[PDB]
Design a protein around this nucleic acid. Sequence first.
RNA 1: CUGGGUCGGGGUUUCGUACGUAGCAGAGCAGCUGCUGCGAUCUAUUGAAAGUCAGCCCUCGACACAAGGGUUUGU
RNA 2: GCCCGGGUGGAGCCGCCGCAGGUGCAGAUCUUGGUGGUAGUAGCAAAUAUUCAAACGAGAACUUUGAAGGCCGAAGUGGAGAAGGGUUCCAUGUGAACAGCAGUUGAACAUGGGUCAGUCGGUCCUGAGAGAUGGGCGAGCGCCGUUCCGAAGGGACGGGCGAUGGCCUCCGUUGCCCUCAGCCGAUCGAAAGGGAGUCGGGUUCAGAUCCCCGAAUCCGGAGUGGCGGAGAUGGGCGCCGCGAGGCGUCCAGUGCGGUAACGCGACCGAUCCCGGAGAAGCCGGCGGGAGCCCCGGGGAGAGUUCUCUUUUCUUUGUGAAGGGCAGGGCGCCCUGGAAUGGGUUCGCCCCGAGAGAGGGGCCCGUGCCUUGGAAAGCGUCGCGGUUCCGGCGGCGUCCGGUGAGCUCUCGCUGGCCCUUGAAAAUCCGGGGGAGAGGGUGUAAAUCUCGCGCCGGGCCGUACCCAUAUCCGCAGCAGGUCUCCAAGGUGAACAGCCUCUGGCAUGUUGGAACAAUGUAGGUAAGGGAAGUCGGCAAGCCGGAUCCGUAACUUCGGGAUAAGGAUUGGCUCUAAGGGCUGGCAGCCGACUUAGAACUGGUGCGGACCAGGGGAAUCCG
RNA 3: UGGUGGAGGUCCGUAGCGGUCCUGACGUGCGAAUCGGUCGUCCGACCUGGGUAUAGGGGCGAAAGACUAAUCGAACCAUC
Lengths: 50, 59, 49
Amino acid sequence: SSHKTFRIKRFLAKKQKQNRPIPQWIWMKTGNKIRYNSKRRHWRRTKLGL
Amino acid sequence: FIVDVKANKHQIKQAVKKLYDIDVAKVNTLIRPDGEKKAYVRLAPDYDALDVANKIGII
Amino acid sequence: IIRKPVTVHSRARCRKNTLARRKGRHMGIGKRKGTANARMPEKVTWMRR
RNA sequence: CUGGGUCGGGGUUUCGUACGUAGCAGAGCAGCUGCUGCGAUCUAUUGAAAGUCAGCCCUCGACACAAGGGUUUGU
RNA sequence: GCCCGGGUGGAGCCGCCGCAGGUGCAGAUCUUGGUGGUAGUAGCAAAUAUUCAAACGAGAACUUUGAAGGCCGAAGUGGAGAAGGGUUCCAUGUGAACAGCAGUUGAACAUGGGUCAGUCGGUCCUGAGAGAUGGGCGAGCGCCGUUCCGAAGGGACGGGCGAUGGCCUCCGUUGCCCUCAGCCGAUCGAAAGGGAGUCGGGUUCAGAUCCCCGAAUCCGGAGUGGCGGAGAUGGGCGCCGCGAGGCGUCCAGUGCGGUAACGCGACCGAUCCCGGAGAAGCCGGCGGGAGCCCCGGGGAGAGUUCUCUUUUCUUUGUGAAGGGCAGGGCGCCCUGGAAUGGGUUCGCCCCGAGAGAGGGGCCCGUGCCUUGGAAAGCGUCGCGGUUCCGGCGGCGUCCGGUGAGCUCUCGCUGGCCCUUGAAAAUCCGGGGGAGAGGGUGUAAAUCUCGCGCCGGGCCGUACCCAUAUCCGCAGCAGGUCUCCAAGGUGAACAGCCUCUGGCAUGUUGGAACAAUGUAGGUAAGGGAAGUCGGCAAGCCGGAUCCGUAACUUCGGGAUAAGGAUUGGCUCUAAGGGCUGGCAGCCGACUUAGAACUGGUGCGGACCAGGGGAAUCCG
RNA sequence: UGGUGGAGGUCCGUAGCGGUCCUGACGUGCGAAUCGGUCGUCCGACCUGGGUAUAGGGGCGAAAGACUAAUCGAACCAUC
Ligand SMILES: [Mg+2]
Ligand SMILES: [Mg+2]
Ligand SMILES: [Mg+2]
Ligand SMILES: [Mg+2]
Ligand SMILES: [Mg+2]
Ligand SMILES: [Mg+2]
Ligand SMILES: [Mg+2]
Ligand SMILES: [Mg+2]
Ligand SMILES: [Mg+2]
Ligand SMILES: [Mg+2]
Ligand SMILES: [Mg+2]
Ligand SMILES: [Mg+2]
Ligand SMILES: [Mg+2]
Ligand SMILES: [Mg+2]
Ligand SMILES: [Mg+2]
Ligand SMILES: [Mg+2]
Ligand SMILES: [Mg+2]
Ligand SMILES: [Mg+2]
Ligand SMILES: [Mg+2]
Ligand SMILES: [Mg+2]
Ligand SMILES: [Mg+2]
Ligand SMILES: [Mg+2]
Ligand SMILES: [Mg+2]
Ligand SMILES: [Mg+2]
Ligand SMILES: [Mg+2]
Ligand SMILES: [Mg+2]
Ligand SMILES: [Mg+2]
Ligand SMILES: [Mg+2]
Ligand SMILES: [Mg+2]
Ligand SMILES: [Mg+2]
Ligand SMILES: [Mg+2]
Ligand SMILES: [Mg+2]
Ligand SMILES: [Mg+2]
Ligand SMILES: [Mg+2]
């Protein structure tokens, strides 16, 4: 919706910022077990609640 | 400029005037989809934006 | 980059048929589907009179 | 020097008489002083025009093509 | 059950005497995980449809461009929004996974970008309602209740006292006293209700009533108010001066005009009181104005030109805010007094409570002219920057007519109600007359008049809005609120065809054309013999002119039933406006009649009631 | 008698709303109720958006034990 509240817009902004993939220098640290970002969300699949 | 979401147009105008000792014609603020506030600051006609950008460091 | 012209949709055929109707053709009782009142309202006729 | 194939030509057959042109044929109408225009339709050319193997018949006309290619098989 | 041999493996393990147990699986439609046959099978069939050439590329039925043929057909497969979604938007790149074929493509993945407001909304008001305090109840978290068992006002013109600052003038700031007086109850509740005020042109890859350019406008503020204009400057007397004009005394001056409707640029005024606007249903008819459509011409550019066509197609303008004038309306005024009644509407309706007839006044003027404004926009022709350009030039943007035509809007008038069809915020006018100003001027108090000065903070703004961005587990034939609406046929916003705009046949293609299906059709003769049952299909169907029964609650039945006609072409007759029984000039669709004519065919596609006699029930 | 007028829980019939018949399609479907033709109604007891009120032995019901988030002759969730 074009009409939206400030807190809704802020929550959307945080969720959008969280959706990037991991930096390529992570996976080759020493004590690392992370292969990829498993929390990525697609707008078609999962609908953010709300 | 990029500013924080707690700044008024008056505050942005005053901050620019103090920091860069210039004059501001008007300010237009929006809030980006990513969160921070973006401000378009229109200067007085007798000040050109290119020289101020020079003094800033962005050219 | 050219703007192509509008495809022709002439009105010569319908205006010729309109001239025929002016003369009184194609307006027999075979070629009419609405009632007489619908085609020409008697209230409007009485108003004009 | 034979073969089919394509095209063409005839035969058969289906529908029903093409476009154009001409007509002092045409309900009439308008203009110019008998002539010129609009006019559905009609008459002649006109049993005309069109289609006709793709699973119709004949050709001996034209055209190119056809002595190939691949996989196997032994008492 | 176990012991050896061989292989793999890479760090722990077993024998005997005792001790302890979460100690032995084939099943429980057992639990979890994995894997088969089925099987390269079912299937990738709702909404008409694709073809040719080229480019890129390893790779093309699916991408891009060009051409052709089609569909959506303005109640759209078009152009925009609300809710919802939340980056899906834009550019570049990739082709691992996904897009049930493929992809050089994507709403996929990966990098980066993108939403600019005093005027657009929220923000304010209150509606149905929600909800504190006082009070009451309750073991208790709490609940009831919204004016009800409340000392519910923290405000103010003005006057007095006290202090301060500014040239302590005059005013401001307070502190105290006097005086003045209701609240309908704190507060919340609408991105469709109320609610002041922004429009035009240009610009981006993606944003525009937001950016730039140019024109405006509303609200709020200002010691000295910045300024003009209004309040305002007159009369009398004694004089001077020939007069003009100038002195000295008195008196007035909070505007003026029109008989009236009312008008003029302003034209003091408090507490208080009255009123208005906000602020009102549904339907019908008619009229005015725009937009669109239509007809006859002038241009400009295109299309056809085998023959014809002064031809066919596209285009041919001006914002907001002021000023003026049309044009609409008036239950507004003045003169006058009317039967032989008159005026008037499509209908009505109106009049001695004042009609007709004259003369005025007011309101809306979204139309036209003008300022804006040609400078910009657009259509063409030609030069430039060889480009990076709001580039520069010429010309044009013209004259008319009509319509029960469609949509919007304004207005008048009527009908219907055992239905009468919101509140508040906010703003304005009036009645009153408490107060203030000055003593004739440098006039003062005061001005809703003209111009001038300053400011308008916060939040939303991208995109989809639907046979692919929402909800249905999904790119699901479902569902989901709205605005705009061309030509022909036709009663029609019906069906069918087309233009602007859009699309690629709905998650695949090729070759065959067996059975059985699904969806359409046609059948000789018979005509319900079929079947539980005329199920299904079929007949009729529009319009014009005739005709229309039983019964009836008298309204209906009724399109009862039953007949005839319908094309094309050529005519005739009738039905009107404007200007000067008549003459001239324009004109919009109708209706009727006639002749001729076609292989009896003519509501030729589309649209489009089978009928009658009875019984039961409501 | 001829006009005029334009009423009505009036008739044909679009959009909208609904859902008769084929007991058609489909029935591991497009779809946990859809599709096609044909149908009822279409100015009123009409259709619809948003706001608001009613909560489980309770609500709401032009009444079918219907509806109350694919759940109804007693919803859903957790616990005993
Ligand atoms: Mg979804
Ligand atoms: Mg190890
Ligand atoms: Mg154990
Ligand atoms: Mg087992
Ligand atoms: Mg198969
Ligand atoms: Mg659309
Ligand atoms: Mg769009
Ligand atoms: Mg995209
Ligand atoms: Mg695939
Ligand atoms: Mg602006
Ligand atoms: Mg309460
Ligand atoms: Mg509120
Ligand atoms: Mg509102
Ligand atoms: Mg009079
Ligand atoms: Mg110009
Ligand atoms: Mg937008
Ligand atoms: Mg198809
Ligand atoms: Mg396809
Ligand atoms: Mg699809
Ligand atoms: Mg399909
Ligand atoms: Mg038969
Ligand atoms: Mg027969
Ligand atoms: Mg039998
Ligand atoms: Mg039937
Ligand atoms: Mg009967
Ligand atoms: Mg009986
Ligand atoms: Mg009944
Ligand atoms: Mg009815
Ligand atoms: Mg069935
Ligand atoms: Mg089946
Ligand atoms: Mg009906
Ligand atoms: Mg109760
Ligand atoms: Mg029962
Ligand atoms: Mg029970």
